[model samples]
Target: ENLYFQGDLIVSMRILGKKRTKTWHKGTLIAIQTVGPGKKYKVKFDNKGKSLLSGNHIAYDYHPPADKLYVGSRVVAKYKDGNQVWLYAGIVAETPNVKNKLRFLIFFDDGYASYVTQSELYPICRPLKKTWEDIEDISCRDFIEEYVTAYPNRPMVLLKSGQLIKTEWEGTWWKSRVEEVDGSLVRILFLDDKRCEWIYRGSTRLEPMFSM
Candidate 1:
């Protein structure tokens, strides 16, 4: 049985009956050549170059460190299927090995579970501190323009006669229900006040009305 897959980084634990003067070596599995019931691996080592080794001679290198993860921490991990690499966010469900080396079981939002190592995972969010001034500069016109643009055909209440109009028409500032708008011109029906009339769009101000 093969204990390691091709492309896995590994450290040589021991050789089959071969005594060495130094410690186990480090390498990456390059290829696997099957020899009948058993398998032989071709490894590219950092210092020893390329060498052929058996399954029992190596152990996966689980060390260059990973972030400390908790059961509820959210993380993004890279999952490879065939030739495509998919990045997804998931929550840590279980930490099988929290000490020494990092290995955890993650439950993806789509209802899938996976065993992920530290190198394949990343933090979902790193929150920053800020103040209210960062988002309070928005003006009233900004919201009005956005709403008007989104619902161009929606009814709006406009004040017909205000202090801006002539003194004789000042108290005539009656509420008008707008029916159509084009550029700076508006067509409105003044409810029981009168029939529809077209007025300069900028001459009136927007006022909130109710529905039936």
Candidate 2:
């Protein structure tokens, strides 16, 4: 059985009165109990709400098994879905149609599930994430075009000073806002630590990740 454990990323259906009120919310699978005829799962919704729900009331996202890519797919490094590195958890963006020519796009959890692709792939175990020393962040540059295009154009201009954007501070991805700009020099006020600086325009990225 594909059993769910604590901290697994899952989706639950929430029903409200009125027409078209059934909504699906993402959450973590906190606990499960076998109390009478069937099972009740304790799901903590992303809405910050919690409840015990029946099995049918909840569903999980379509991630492939730890070592098996179904005839369908997504991949995760760990079984419980804990506080692991985000890059290793990926959903298949493009379908793998042609046997040997199976090129697929993988959109992972980091940069808010930002996407990248590869022509060939299989189960990515712990080794991939743990062994990646200094290459993961730099590897994102491979899709900087897709990342930039996904967010669209918002330049660092003195005219529009309150634009929310992403940038690197101390070489880490961070949420920052543009407060000033001069030629290639753009001033940034970090949404995180409130550390402000005048940085280069190229250093500013558009797509914001939930991390930091």
Candidate 3:
């Protein structure tokens, strides 16, 4: 376990305010339990306030910009906090566009409405990276590419140790890392199951789309 210390910024989904479609808030970790399993954390938030929550609801980091957005869903938006800014609660209110950079509208309780670009906001729930059991073959593939492979031919190099990737063992894509790679044989270590396997050059290995 990565030991969390005092005053570290933490994000928790066990919010203490009004109900939402989903919600996680940024806060300072105030304490860790000395009496229980120690998964519990006492946090005073950057937005609505405080709560003492267990590890299941506390994600170590705030999520990256979301990949999915839906109308009428609750979310947290960027807000100014004195000299600094914060991510506070809000609701999605309109059809989101994906023409270039995705953009959409949000409604806050004070009647504030803003159509912001995708990168500017975050989801109420932390977007957890998927485990190997979460996806299938089509979403997994070898990272190496020829000049004609991608639409613009993203010429990916061969796999290397510590590179984030995905692979399939029983037809399900599992998040993995390169343990080592030869010109044809690839040594893989599964991120979730902590298992390792050696696969061929043309097998299902891929640079992952989801990562920490």
Q: Best candidate per TM-score, number?
A: 3
For residues 1-212, what per-residue lDDT tens digits would candidate 3 score against the true structure? 33444344333333322223234555666656645434556767776566766443444443334445555444566654358755555555444445313456554433334555566565533222321111123233122112113323222346678887767655478788888864334678898989776554343334342221
lDDT of 2 at 55: 47
Q: Which residue pairs of candidate 2 clash? A: none
Per candidate, the number of residue pairs that clash is 1, 0, 2
Considering lDDT, where higher is better, how would the candidates rank from best to worst?
A: 3, 1, 2
Off by over 4 Å in 3: 1-25, 28-41, 44-50, 53-67, 80-86, 98-101, 126-212
Q: Which of the two candidates, 2 or 3, achieves a greater lDDT against the reference? A: 3
Off by over 4 Å in 2: 1-23, 56-62, 65-95, 99-212
RMSD to the hidden true structure, all candidates: 25.1, 15.9, 18.0
Better of 2 and 3 by TM-score: 3
**TM-scores for all predictions:** 0.26, 0.24, 0.32
What tens digits encode model 2's per-residue C-alpha lDDT throughout 1-212?
23344343332322211011233445666666765545566767665677776543454444333234432243432211245322244433334444324434444334223222232233422222222221235444344334334433424223247888777655567787888764434567888788776543433343433231
Local distance difference test, candidate 3 = 0.48
Give per-residue lDDT, candidate 2, residue 144.
39
Query: lDDT of each model, Cα atoms only?
Result: 0.45, 0.43, 0.48
- Clashing pairs in model 3, backbone N/Cα/C closer than 3 A: 132-174, 141-205
